[PDB]
Symmetry: C2
Subunit: 49 residues, 2 copies
């Protein structure tokens, strides 16, 4: 039978662990360097004669 091989691995290094930062939708917001607000938006208008 081909079976599921699992290698022997060492304890988790703290340096490896990023997951605590984005496990919840509010944190995925928190991770943004800046949020999208209405006053950031500029809308083009084409004026005809």
């Amino acid at each position: 039978m081909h079976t599921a091989e699992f290698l022997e691995t060492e304890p988790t290094e703290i340096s490896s662990v990023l997951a605590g930062g984005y496990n919840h939708p509010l944190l995925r917001q928190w991770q943004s360097e800046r949020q999208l607000t209405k006053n950031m938006l500029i809308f083009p208008l084409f004026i005809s004669d």
Copy 2:
């Protein structure tokens, strides 16, 4: 009479001129590296037993 003395000065250097960046309230918003949104706020609660 003491009168209002005005010194002779040279033409404006472009490097001196910052005013075009914040003459309107929308620009003073634009100048922020990031805007204040509701989801940035964390409120402390003191729970009693």
